[PDB]
């Protein structure tokens, strides 16, 4: 302990030899994730990649000014959309039952989002039969074959 330099802060005081983490897998891992994602697309083909996410304000005073992707839609919101949680789920919508709406505007955003979703939707029933709730769209839509990303369609 010699010079003016700042008081050291011990690091290797314990036996770290047992406790080191190595990052070489990272290389391959990224790749794996890619293929996973891709193989999801292929197996999900007619449907979108990421399920529908509502939006909210962030949880901190400093973050309030910003916008964040929620985990799920408020039952209140599904009501104003006219969807049952169960149905919305069969649709690819993400629902969260512990979240609550304390503002008109927070209802608004998500209604707008839901409606936007539905309008742009295509629904395949058991072949050539048609249905009612959230309804069901014409057989010709089967030919329309849309592979789409949610940010493009519902931003």
């Amino acid at each position: 302990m010699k010079h003016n330099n700042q008081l050291p802060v011990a690091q290797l005081r314990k036996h770290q030899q047992f406790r080191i983490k190595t990052f070489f897998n990272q290389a391959a891992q990224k790749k794996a994730r890619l293929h996973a994602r891709r193989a999801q697309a292929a197996a999900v083909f007619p449907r979108p990649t990421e399920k529908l996410q509502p939006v909210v304000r962030k949880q901190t005073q400093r973050y309030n000014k910003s916008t964040k992707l929620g985990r799920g839609f408020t039952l209140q919101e599904l009501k104003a959309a006219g969807i049952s949680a169960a149905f919305a789920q069969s649709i690819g919508i993400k629902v969260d039952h512990r979240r609550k709406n304390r503002c008109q505007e927070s209802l608004e955003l998500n209604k707008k989002r839901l409606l936007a979703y539905v309008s742009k939707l295509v629904l395949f029933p058991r072949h050539q039969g048609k249905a009612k709730k959230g309804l069901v769209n014409d057989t010709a839509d089967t030919s329309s074959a849309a592979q789409n990303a949610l940010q493009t369609s519902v931003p």
């Binding site: 007619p46 449907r47 979108p48 169960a86 149905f87 789920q89 069969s90 649709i91 690819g92 979703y117 742009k120 939707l121 295509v122 629904l123 395949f124 029933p125 839509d141 329309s144 074959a145 849309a146 592979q147 789409n148 990303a149 949610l150 493009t152 369609s153 519902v154």
Partner: peptide, 15 residues
């Protein structure tokens, strides 16, 4: 029952 009355559907979004 849920599997019958709810289940999962084929959907597409358009853009």
């Amino acid at each position: 029952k849920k599997l019958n009355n709810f289940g999962l559907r084929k959907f597409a979004l358009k853009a």
